[PDB]
Amino acid sequence: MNRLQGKRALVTGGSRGIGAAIAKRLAADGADVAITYEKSAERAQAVVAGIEALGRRAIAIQADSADPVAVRNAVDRVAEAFGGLDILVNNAGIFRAGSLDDLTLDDIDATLNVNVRAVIVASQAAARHLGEGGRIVSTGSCLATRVPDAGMSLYAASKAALIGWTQGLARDLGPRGITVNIVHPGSTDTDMNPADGAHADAQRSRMAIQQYGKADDVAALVAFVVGPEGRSINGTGLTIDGGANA
Amino acid sequence: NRLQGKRALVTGGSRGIGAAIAKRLAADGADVAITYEKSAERAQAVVAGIEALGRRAIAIQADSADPVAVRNAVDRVAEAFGGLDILVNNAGIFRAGSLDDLTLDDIDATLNVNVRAVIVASQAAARHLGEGGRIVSTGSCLATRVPDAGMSLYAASKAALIGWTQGLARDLGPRGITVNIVHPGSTDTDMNPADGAHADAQRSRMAIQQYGKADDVAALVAFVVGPEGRSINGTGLTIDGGANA
Amino acid sequence: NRLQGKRALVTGGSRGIGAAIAKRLAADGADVAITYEKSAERAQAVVAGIEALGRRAIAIQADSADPVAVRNAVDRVAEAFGGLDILVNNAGIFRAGSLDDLTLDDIDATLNVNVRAVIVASQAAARHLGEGGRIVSTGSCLATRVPDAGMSLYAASKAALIGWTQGLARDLGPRGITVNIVHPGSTDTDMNPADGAHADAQRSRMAIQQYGKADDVAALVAFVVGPEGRSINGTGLTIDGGANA
Amino acid sequence: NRLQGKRALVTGGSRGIGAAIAKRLAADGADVAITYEKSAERAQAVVAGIEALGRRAIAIQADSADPVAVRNAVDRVAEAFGGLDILVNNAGIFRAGSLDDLTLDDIDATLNVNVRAVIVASQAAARHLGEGGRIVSTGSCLATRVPDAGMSLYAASKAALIGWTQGLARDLGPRGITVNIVHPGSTDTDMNPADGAHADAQRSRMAIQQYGKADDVAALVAFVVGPEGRSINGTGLTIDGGANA
Ligand SMILES: NC(=O)c1ccc[n+]([C@@H]2O[C@H](COP(=O)([O-])OP(=O)(O)OC[C@H]3O[C@@H](n4cnc5c(N)ncnc54)[C@H](OP(=O)(O)O)[C@@H]3O)[C@@H](O)[C@H]2O)c1
Ligand SMILES: NC(=O)c1ccc[n+]([C@@H]2O[C@H](COP(=O)([O-])OP(=O)(O)OC[C@H]3O[C@@H](n4cnc5c(N)ncnc54)[C@H](OP(=O)(O)O)[C@@H]3O)[C@@H](O)[C@H]2O)c1
């Protein structure tokens, strides 16, 4: 009777922000939910405790997205714990600020490893477990397709990479019945992008309706895509950005 | 109810995707008006089913090709329901034919029904919609990807709605009305039956080769115009089985 | 000559981007016809300059809003030149105004001139074009990205041409005719003067803040229709100073 | 000479599209450096041909997967030529294989060569480029449309360059340097031979079913970086025979 009755999900980067909202919403819709995190162990356990209080199974796994072995092992741990896997949400991500002149190799490698390679590795590992009706969603960005200012180029490249990955992976997994999609948030009130931050006025100015998005609304859209009326949504990008990309 | 008290107009709501949209908005709590061209009995059956849920519903005969009829239909719904919160521009036609055989009548009918009617209804709705109002149009996966011959006029008509949607989101931003487009792929309807002559070729283009359900297209429209869709704006949402991957 | 022996028609060739395209195709070797609506003096000056190069050239008054005039103009050029190799759909209008003030006349004029004329001329030209023929239309960076209010009808009309272009490339593929769209950004013309009141705002959207030259737009069109453009097909080429980045 | 006095670096210039670009920039008047990984004989033959035109040319073994080597290659060219005007990021790999079989070595090699090397070279070149400088990268029609299984890592690596290109155009706007991406479709090279096993399937996706010529891709790159390309910026130019229509 739950929209996600019996479903088994992993949300990377689920301790805070958009990922925590997604984890809570999938649980609210009926799924058992695992999350990964890098450092926020207390906050991750609190997400888990809240999901368990609903009567769901939940686990939090410390797994550095930059480490492909940790990512692959986290996916396998979820499938072992829950008996299988139905939903993967690749959400953990970083935004390294800086000018072109100042860009470091460490920032390039960190961004490509966390924002791109971890998505590829988790997707491949999840595909070993997912069956017909399984769902993969990744968190992109409105910046993947429209870059309004300087200082965003490395991040934009990392999110644009996920568009090609998503469309190709939908072809790879089509015969097995697994959909692959990307949700592109615009400005969304989180620790990465606080609505009271110094740059928030400029970000609101780009929107058609000038209001930061809610993480819970991004989560609602992810939950629709991975839910019982989302089966024909596949290989595509869904932008929730207040009209910034109009 | 997710759409408690909302007042909606779905053009071309007598059959197909539009009937599914009208039924879903009503199931979610909205009062729903539909237009139709000729299917008076089917339209009234849609209306009767919505009334049976306890909602208000009306069906207005209004030829999308006639811009006066379209504008009047929008105003008549606002009069009948007291206001208007949601406009879904869904009525559309697909005139089959080769480039060689393309007629002026087909060009005019397609542009008038699939484009001009959307512009006219959107403008009229903008005189009524308040803060939090929602406009959605039905596009097509063919608006951005055209796989074969014989689709060019139709693809042009749907691509036009992309520019309209993005610009209109800018126009209506200060008033707080979102404007979006939902692009179906192959969806089992009278226009595109899943047992039709072209249906194998259409399925072959998808990642998961099954025609879509009109009810799922309706579910996505209902999400966009609902209480968690306020930040979805100026954008296209494709539900096509992966055809455009 | 890059376009030695080629036979071209550029709609709206009396001034602006169209005149620049006409002059460049002629400079590259082509015989060139142009259409215009009212600017007989400026059209004749374009023709006289092309004739001074030694090419054939004609100017046809042909209202793009009249489908019969458009078809007949295409047929007249093919008859006069003995054939047709290149069609450039460039004539267009930009009706300024708010959504509230948008008139049915504005809607019809924009769809008729900016969309229907392109479809009609393309179909007419396809009766004359052969293997190696080329169709290009003038789009706009606004077709895919609309930054402000007041542009929605125009953006819709240019976005329509993307779907048309991609579908027509499929239609004409077996016959070896490419179909492409060039999307200018802010380009210094009577429609969009670089020293105008709103030109500062348009420059601010660009990466390099300088209006484009009509002659550079013409250079890109000339590349697409020339001897190294055969594999450019079904696509949009944007020349907008980075506005759409 | 359209590129009189210009000083260019083409990564992966020993074979294929890169060799064609290097040769075309030299034919247009530029001094040209190339990088290569292992084809020393081929690289020296490209250099010798350019020198026979009267231009300066150098070949540098520089593994794109090594960011220090990439940065050093850019600095070496700028030192040898006295400056730098044009950077073409062309070196790339396509690791064939299924999702099931994808290795971490494949993932790392593809991201290092196809993405990180472009970022590193672009940043290094920006220390030498001045007003009027040009950066172009070789993308792929697969960056935006993926028709089959087995392409997903590669498609991701080329899609990455679209976001890089648009963002870097913003970064380098105040300095007057344009940044663009040219997306070839099926182009007859060692990576994608026109008589290879998958070549029939690739031709079947096109509107005009013939593999592209590397020299035509080079001609389009040469246009973008030349004297009429100043307003082409932050954009993708696809040369794919209509595959992406
Ligand atoms: N907020 C926006 O406006 C916005 C807009 C567009 C896209 N996005 C994308 O949305 C996603 C979530 O962003 P957010 O705003 O919610 O960010 P956030 O507040 O910074 O939260 C980031 C989340 O990712 C986790 N994470 C980061 N690096 C990780 C690593 N190496 N290993 C494991 N987990 C890691 C964090 O774990 P810890 O708690 O342990 O640090 C946390 O759970 C990201 O992909 C971001 O790029 C955000
Ligand atoms: N089915 C697909 O695979 C597909 C895919 C992409 C996009 N679409 C789009 O989805 C929309 C609905 O398509 P559908 O498949 O549901 O089509 P359908 O089965 O042919 O239903 C068409 C609906 O539009 C109405 N309509 C058509 N022309 C009209 C006019 N001149 N005035 C008033 N109403 C008019 C019809 O009214 P009557 O009942 O009175 O005739 C009917 O309610 C269209 O915009 C279509 O282009 C469909």
Ligand SMILES: NC(=O)c1ccc[n+]([C@@H]2O[C@H](COP(=O)([O-])OP(=O)(O)OC[C@H]3O[C@@H](n4cnc5c(N)ncnc54)[C@H](OP(=O)(O)O)[C@@H]3O)[C@@H](O)[C@H]2O)c1
């Ligand atoms: N300028 C820009 O910034 C810009 C940017 C993007 C796209 N565009 C597009 O580029 C194209 C050319 O624009 P432009 O800036 O060169 O404009 P322009 O200076 O206004 O010239 C318009 C041309 O189109 C002709 N024309 C207009 N309506 C016509 C009709 N009904 N019948 C026949 N010819 C007609 C005009 O003929 P008359 O001389 O007889 O009036 C003239 O030759 C248009 O499609 C426009 O939308 C322009």
Ligand SMILES: NC(=O)c1ccc[n+]([C@@H]2O[C@H](COP(=O)([O-])OP(=O)(O)OC[C@H]3O[C@@H](n4cnc5c(N)ncnc54)[C@H](OP(=O)(O)O)[C@@H]3O)[C@@H](O)[C@H]2O)c1
């Ligand atoms: N061919 C097509 O159909 C097609 C279509 C779309 C995009 N592309 C792209 O076009 C570009 C050129 O492709 P192509 O078809 O000409 O390929 P190719 O025949 O395989 O030539 C590849 C070139 O890149 C160089 N290269 C590769 N890896 C390198 C590395 N680690 N360090 C330095 N140089 C390296 C090669 O050097 P060595 O000679 O030393 O090996 C060679 O010069 C690539 O980015 C490719 O992805 C090709």
